[PDB]
């Protein structure tokens, strides 16, 4: 099984183009858990495998790279994912993380409270969300997805990317449809958490304009159809060799351009992971006082 040695599985176009009803998700290895080496939290393997898959994507990686990590906390009050992001990202990357509840992390900036209180003063380069709310029909959810959808439309650099956790029941029509505004997208399921309906909705290289017309409710039905169709074995073999784990130091340029200047060359560079368009000031991220 070569897929044992890959970090996970990505939803193929074979299933993106289907037209099916939304069914219940039925996973054969449900209630099974991958063992971890003593002292290693499972979310370490899960985040590492997500980073490993993103290593194969055309991520923009500038100097002073702007990364925000939502849902970074745990009931243990620690943030293993943020530490993986620190291990993965360039040393000069700026990591901001956030969670409803108190935690301690290795981020540069840590903000407690509802993600809606998180004020992004300037556009960012990568958004990671592990936000999940454990609280008959399976309809599109609002929750933190309204905030994330607006962030994509306003506070994400052209050329930027997102990786947003969804599950069978925690998902959003609008967020699937926003994936059509990236140069490429998929849902990525780690091998470490293969027995869960969890997936990471990836949008790679934001274009600010519709490249693919997506029916978000039908696409979540296709995602579940794919999960129901696809054996996935628990595994972390991809973590055995970590000699190339760190994100490539691409030196991706950051340009300021007006909308009228964005021609086919610029679209092409954004789409190849070779450019970001946004301000180059210093990033300001803070807690807003709401209501």
């Amino acid at each position: 099984a070569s897929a044992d040695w890959k970090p996970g599985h990505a939803m193929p176009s074979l299933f993106k183009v289907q037209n099916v009803n939304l069914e219940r998700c039925e996973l054969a290895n449900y209630k099974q858990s991958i063992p971890m080496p003593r002292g290693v939290h499972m979310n370490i393997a899960k985040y590492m495998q997500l980073c490993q898959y993103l290593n194969t994507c055309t991520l923009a990686v500038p100097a002073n790279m702007r990364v925000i990590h939502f849902g970074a906390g745990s009931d243990k009050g620690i943030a293993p994912g943020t530490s993986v992001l620190r291990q993965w990202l360039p040393t000069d990357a700026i990591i901001i993380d956030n969670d409803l509840n108190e935690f301690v992390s290795d981020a540069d900036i840590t903000l407690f409270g509802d993600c809606v209180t998180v004020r992004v003063g300037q556009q960012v380069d990568l958004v990671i969300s592990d936000m999940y709310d454990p609280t008959g029909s399976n309809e599109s959810k609002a929750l933190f997805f309204t905030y994330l959808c607006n962030l994509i439309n306003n506070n994400l650099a052209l050329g930027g990317s997102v990786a947003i956790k969804i599950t069978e029941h925690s998902w959003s029509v609008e967020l699937y449809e926003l994936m059509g505004k990236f140069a490429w997208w998929t849902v990525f399921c780690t091998n470490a958490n293969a027995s869960s309906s969890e997936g990471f909705l990836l949008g790679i290289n934001y274009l600010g304009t519709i490249k693919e017309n997506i029916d978000g409710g039908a696409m979540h039905a296709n995602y579940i159809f794919w999960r129901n169709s696809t054996p996935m074995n628990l595994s972390t073999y991809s973590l055995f060799d970590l000699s190339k784990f760190q994100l490539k130091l691409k030196g991706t340029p950051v340009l300021q351009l007006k909308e009228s200047q964005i021609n086919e060359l610029v679209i092409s560079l954004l789409s190849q992971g070779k450019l970001l368009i946004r301000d180059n000031d210093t990033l300001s991220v803070s807690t807003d006082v709401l209501v």
Binding site: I44, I78, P80, T91, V104, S105, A107
Partner: protein
């Protein structure tokens, strides 16, 4: 964890309170963030990326800092933590209590290795 963490809020000497506690048999603080790394690093104490050798484990810095973990003021004159946002290498034989180890040891200054656990300056 809630036990020893609340315990160091009842003292003016959190370091001694933690060390005395684990020295008396108390359970070390758990849930330190242990990284997966190619055991091919330099072995220095604190580093921007993991640097464990074959005889070490690397941890997220904030998670092995008593002051970070208990949300109490750091003693450093600059007010900035020496571990937070960095990675800390722990000798393999001391992984049972990384928080106590960091409270009990010092990285060399003319050299970045743990004194007694890698620093060969004498």
């Amino acid at each position: 964890n809630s036990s020893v963490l609340s315990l160091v809020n009842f003292t003016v000497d959190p370091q001694k309170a933690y060390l005395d506690f684990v020295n008396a048999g108390g359970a070390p603080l758990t849930n330190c963030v242990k990284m997966l790394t190619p055991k091919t690093g330099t072995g220095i104490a604190i580093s921007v990326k993991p640097e464990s050798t074959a005889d070490q484990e690397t941890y997220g810095g904030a998670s092995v800092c008593l002051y970070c973990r208990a949300h109490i003021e750091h003693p450093d004159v600059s007010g900035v933590c020496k571990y937070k946002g960095k990675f800390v290498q722990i000798p393999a034989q001391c992984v049972r209590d990384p928080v106590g180890f960091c409270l009990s040891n010092t990285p060399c200054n003319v050299c970045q290795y743990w004194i007694g656990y890698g620093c060969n300056c004498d």
